[PDB]
């Protein structure tokens, strides 16, 4: 039984991982 | 460079659509980019290795998230033999009403049924609830945040490592044998002793109680006193109900051998003693090389000294240290070669020595896992020889490697290639000749005229490990041998029970049908090696092109002169060996599936008679097992196999589309595009719009690649649709 808030926590940690991937991707591109 | 690709000024000023195509396919060839230094090259590879590591852990966090959220893991751990594991749910607006109920058969919402085996693996390592799978997906989601920060961090100017740090071979092997391999195997022994083996014993040990619950009743004092036999005192019984405390032992490190009798899977106490012994060997192995502390070997000194004084290897291994340290392509080619062996070994040992509980009873997962890892191993082996061929063009120095073992391969490359040519031709003349012989005499009504060679050498190997059905009586099938006596005190009662049980996969009963297909597999291995070895050894030059290293690894041809030079580049021998790889893994996985689908089907004698000739493969394997697949939808409705029947035809179409780029070549298409450019420039109201890149046909190498990628994707998708829907449709 996963709750609604547990799905929302994972989406916030995922959208922070999307920011860190763009920061790694922009640094590799330079 | 302005005007993308930024890294290639040559493609940046291309006026045609070739610029965007070639900018994509050269984006990761970092050594070929403009202004690339060696120090910048290693730092970009290091940071993009952090990005690839984050993608793996995000993918693993997604598998754990979707099973915890949308799957039925808690219902699967309750009834493992009756429950179908859910991969994820389906949300597709194109679904009709009857497709929604076809995929939500035992459930509320439409689902995909998982064939990756993650349910059987997570259950074996101790997962029991959906909350535990969720917390694992969060931790891998934050581990890949850290790996994405570390790739950013190690590109900042104060944290970019020097080129000497990247060339420190002795300190990297010392840590990667100890820390990466041995310590992680010691830590995985820590997991399965503390978590997984109590969970199979009916005891919950989680983060809430693992500091106050010892994994053994004696509790770590027999380790420090050297009384290590306490950890093997009472194993689980032969009547232990798995996952419960009934019949359960307390031993944490055994050498039982064979399988747990209920799950038909390896004992977790054997895996713990395996991982612990693997841990010690690798920790010791990480004390070989000379780091900052004076002791240890210098790897340049070992290679320089290993020259046989008979002189049969000429200068020995001198020059090989500086060859490997300065060639990332030789390093990558060695790494892909061992990974390809490690992935083949993974497939061959996971079906036969079942590691996960109830994995051998999931017939579609076992077929999916073998076919997955054997196709992965084929791709890794082709890439190992491809990057071995890039090394000879780009990195091989003929003066540094003077008369060593590397240079002497080029010195007798005609002897190597023409003897691979002999063994390929010998295997193909006689394996195909014997199959056609057996086809002809069975077609004429005389199957007793078949040439059926018994594979007695491999039957001798089974009998040497204790298989009693061939009545050879040699080493472990002979109770008088010292290998049998010394061994019966340890693993051999469990092993002899497992190897002589005809209802598992440990050393399957083989006959003359297994003879002819192994010589077809040996044919496919030898020809695929022959194309790849001739690709690497002729990468620098042949009689047809003595200056071939000046032109690089990949180039179209050298023109129609000197007879014609189509597909002369070393890239083109990769391209030709990819067809031979897929054919070879085709013959391997066809053989695994048909031998298993007749064992699971209860008629193993159908394989023994019909595999001797080709019509048995066509009629009794391809045509017969296609029937549940192609009835995934029909004029009378559909079922949940309808996605695999669609993918089956989807795979046939991409394969055939690849033939177009494989057979039609460029100058036909460039002339056809010129009339299309004319028609657009002369059509009113479309004359308002113009391209900014001139439309051209795809280049010669590009459509070789595009036709190969269509050929390979259609190859994979057709067999994945067939190997899954035939096993799910039958069982």
């Amino acid at each position: 039984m996963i709750y609604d808030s547990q799905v929302y926590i994972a989406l916030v940690i995922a959208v922070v991982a999307s920011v860190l991937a763009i920061r790694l991707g922009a640094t590799l591109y330079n | 460079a302005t005007k993308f690709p930024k890294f290639s000024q040559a493609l940046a000023q291309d006026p045609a659509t070739r610029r965007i195509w070639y900018g994509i396919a050269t984006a990761h060839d970092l050594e070929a980019h403009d202004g690339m230094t060696e120090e910048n090259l290693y730092q970009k590879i290091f940071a993009s290795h952090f990005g690839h590591l984050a993608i793996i852990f995000l993918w693993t966090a997604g598998n754990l998230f979707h099973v915890a959220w949308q799957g039925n893991f808690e219902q699967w751990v309750a009834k493992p033999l009756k429950t179908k594991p859910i991969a994820h749910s389906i949300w597709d607006p194109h679904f009709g009403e009857s497709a929604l109920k076809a995929f939500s058969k035992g459930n509320t919402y439409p689902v995909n049924i998982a064939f990756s085996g993650v349910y059987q693996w997570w259950y074996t390592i101790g997962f029991r609830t959906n909350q535990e799978l969720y917390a694992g997906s969060i931790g891998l989601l934050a581990l890949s945040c850290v790996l994405l920060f570390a790739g950013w961090l190690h590109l900042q100017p104060k944290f970019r490592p020097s080129l000497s740090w990247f060339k420190n071979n002795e300190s990297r092997l010392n840590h990667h044998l100890s820390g990466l391999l041995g310590v992680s195997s010691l830590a995985w022994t820590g997991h399965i002793v503390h978590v997984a083996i109590p969970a199979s014993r009916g005891v919950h040990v989680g983060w809430d109680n693992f500091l106050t619950t010892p994994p053994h009743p004696a509790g770590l004092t027999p380790f420090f006193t050297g009384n290590w036999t306490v950890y093997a005192e009472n194993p689980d019984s032969a009547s232990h109900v798995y996952g419960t405390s009934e019949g359960a032992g307390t031993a944490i490190l055994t050498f039982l051998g064979g399988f747990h009798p209920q799950t038909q899977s390896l004992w977790l106490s054997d895996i713990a003693h395996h991982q612990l012994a693997i841990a010690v060997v690798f920790i010791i192995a990480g004390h070989m090389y000379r780091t900052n502390f004076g002791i240890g070997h210098n790897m340049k000194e070992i290679l320089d000294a290993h020259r046989p004084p008979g002189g049969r290897l000429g200068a020995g291994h001198v020059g090989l240290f500086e060859t490997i340290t300065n060639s990332l392509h030789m390093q990558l080619g060695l790494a892909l070669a061992s990974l390809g062996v490690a992935t083949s070994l993974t497939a061959q040992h996971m079906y036969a020595l079942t590691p996960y509980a109830y994995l051998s009873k999931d017939f579609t997962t076992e077929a999916a896992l073998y076919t997955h890892h054997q196709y992965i191993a084929g791709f890794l082996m082709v890439g190992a020889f491809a990057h071995g061929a890039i090394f000879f063009v780009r990195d091989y120095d003929p003066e540094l490697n003077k008369n060593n073992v590397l240079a002497r391969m080029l010195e007798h490359k005609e002897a190597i290639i023409s003897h691979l040519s002999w063994a390929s031709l010998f295997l193909g003349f006689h394996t195909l000749g014997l199959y056609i012989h057996n086809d002809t005499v069975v077609a004429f009504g005389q199957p007793e005229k078949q040439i059926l060679f018994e594979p007695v050498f491999a039957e001798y190997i089974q009998a040497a490990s204790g298989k009693a059905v061939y009545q050879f009586n040699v080493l472990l099938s002979s109770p008088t041998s010292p290998a049998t006596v010394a061994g019966n005190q340890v693993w051999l009662p469990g092993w002899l029970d497992a190897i002589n049980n005809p209802k598992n996969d440990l050393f399957l009963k083989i006959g003359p049908g297994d003879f002819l297909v192994h010589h077809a597999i040996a044919l496919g291995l030898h020809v695929t090696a022959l194309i790849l070895v001739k690709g690497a050894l002729d990468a620098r030059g042949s009689k047809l092109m003595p200056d071939k290293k000046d032109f690089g690894y990949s180039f179209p041809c050298d023109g129609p002169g000197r007879g014609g030079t189509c597909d002369i580049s070393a890239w083109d021998a990769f391209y030709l060996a990819m067809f031979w790889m897929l054919n070879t893994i085709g013959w391997v996985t066809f053989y695994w599936h048909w031998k298993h689908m007749t064992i699971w089907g209860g008629n193993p004698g159908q394989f023994d008679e019909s595999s001797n000739y080709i019509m048995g493969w066509l009629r009794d394997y391809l045509w017969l097992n296609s029937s549940p697949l192609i009835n995934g939808y029909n004029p009378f409705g559909m079922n949940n196999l309808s996605v695999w029947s669609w993918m089956f035809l989807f795979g046939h179409l991409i394969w055939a589309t690849g033939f177009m780029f494989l057979i039609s070549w460029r100058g036909y298409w460039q002339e056809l595009i010129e009339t299309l450019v004319w028609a657009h420039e002369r059509t009113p109201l479309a004359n308002l719009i113009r391209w900014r890149d001139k439309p051209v046909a795809l280049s010669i190498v590009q459509a070789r690649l595009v036709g190969l990628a269509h050929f390979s994707v259609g190859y994979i998708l057709t067999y994945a649709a067939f190997v899954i829907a035939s096993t799910s449709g039958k069982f």
Binding site: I2, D4, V7, Y8 | K3, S89, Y109
Partner: protein
Amino acid sequence: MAAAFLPSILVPIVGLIFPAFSMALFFLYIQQDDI
């Protein structure tokens, strides 16, 4: 399923809107005459 509405939101974003956005940005980026 727990938050059963979430596939009805995220699958049209990942399947339609994000590919429309990313193919448009790559098309704009490959036509730039500067970097």
